[PDB]
Amino acid sequence: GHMSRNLLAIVHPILRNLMEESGETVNMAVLDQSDHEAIIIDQVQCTHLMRMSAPIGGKLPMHASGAGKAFLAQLSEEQVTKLLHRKGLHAYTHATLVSPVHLKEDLAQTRKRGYSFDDEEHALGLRCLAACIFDEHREPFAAISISGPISRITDDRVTEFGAMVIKAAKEVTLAYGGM
């Protein structure tokens, strides 16, 4: 499935809603199946002075980011192993899953859990939760995420945050099909 500008306008209402509810910046990122890259293509920023603010068109690391890992957690260990050298498991922070053992392990927990979770892996003090968007062939082509500072995305809101992003992704996957 591809991301048409038309579809974005239809779904925008979902990103705005998740923003108000979570109180954090919301992003929509598309999966580049040719280059294996998570590209931000939409965003609704929260109003807090201190917040996450990525540039539209910005890329996200596949192994150390909400959207990245929410995608990576869809590919086989062989595929993953490919991107290990294909892309690169760069070390953004001491928490970054630089070792494929742990990574693949977290990737596993992601599918189980439903939503990815970057805990200060992409940047110090940043938390992120993402959940894939599905086309017709049940293929994940997009990912919706909530990213904010740990000071506000507290440990006891993680699950409540992970649920919000499921409810919003589901709402996009369905509203998508048949329009």
Oligomer: monomer
**What is the helix tally?**
5
Alpha-beta content class? alpha+beta
**Beta-strand segment tally:** 6
Share of residues in strands = 15-25%
The level-1 CATH class: Alpha Beta
CATH H-level name... which superfamily? GAF domain
What distance lies between the first and last C-alpha atoms, to the nearest angstrom?
14 Å
Total count of domains: 1
Helix content: 25-40%
Cα Rg: 15 Å
**At CATH's second level, what is the architecture?**
2-Layer Sandwich
CATH topology: Beta-Lactamase
Top keywords for this entry?
179 residues, alpha+beta, Beta-Lactamase, 6-stranded antiparallel β-sheet, globular
Describe this structure in words.
The chain has one domain (1-178): GAF domain (Beta-Lactamase). It contains five helices and six strands. The chain has helices spanning 5-22, 66-72, 77-88, 100-113, 158-176, and strands spanning 25-32, 37-44, 59-60, 118-119, 126-134, 140-149. It has a six-stranded antiparallel β-sheet with strand order 3-2-1-6-5-4, sandwiched between helices. It is globular, with a radius of gyration of 15 Å. The PDB classes it as transcription. The entry lists the keywords midwest center for structural genomics, alpha/beta domain, transcription regulator, PSI, Protein Structure Initiative, mcsg.
Can I get a quick summary?
Keywords: DNA-binding, Glyoxylate bypass, Repressor, Transcription, Transcription regulation. By secondary structure, the protein is of the alpha+beta class.
